[PDB]
Amino acid sequence: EQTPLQEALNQLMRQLQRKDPSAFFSFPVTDFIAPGYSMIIKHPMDFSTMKEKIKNNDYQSIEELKDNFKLMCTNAMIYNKPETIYYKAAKKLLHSGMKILSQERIQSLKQSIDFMA
Numbered sequence: 001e002q003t004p005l006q007e008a009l010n011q012l013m014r015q016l017q018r019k020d021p022s023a024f025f026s027f028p029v030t031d032f033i034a035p036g037y038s039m040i041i042k043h044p045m046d047f048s049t050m051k052e053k054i055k056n057n058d059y060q061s062i063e064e065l066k067d068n069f070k071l072m073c074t075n076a077m078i079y080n081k082p083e084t085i086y087y088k089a090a091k092k093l094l095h096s097g098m099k100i101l102s103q104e105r106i107q108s109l110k111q112s113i114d115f116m117a
């Protein structure tokens, strides 16, 4: 059903989502919630969109998921001002996920994914 790469991506996604208990990043931000969001943020991203990309096999590396995760956090730091709870939640999530998506974990997974070919 799923490739070893897809399974690794999902395990990383579950660790990243454990760092968003308030659930701000679960689903796309709507303009109803955040007026003008669609005019400000050119490339929206959220965890549910990322989980669909994993399911549809749109990622060919962990690094592409890592780029989408960084994009998701920095979008929140562009739309929301530094003093806001969403900016500070994004900054904390980005820092936590950069260790969850560590280059060391990526290297380890690359080997075990390669050996499962």
Ligand SMILES: CCOC(=O)Nc1cc(-c2ccc(C)c(NS(C)(=O)=O)c2)nn2c(C)nnc12
Pocket (backbone or CB within 6 Å): 023, 024, 025, 026, 027, 028, 029, 030, 033, 034, 035, 075, 076, 079, 080, 086
């Ligand atoms: C105009 C005031 O500014 C905002 O309301 N901005 C933002 C708000 C929220 C937010 C709120 C409440 C909830 C329940 C959620 N979760 S959901 C339904 O989207 O999964 C998200 N996320 N957010 C993200 C990311 N980036 N900016 C914002």
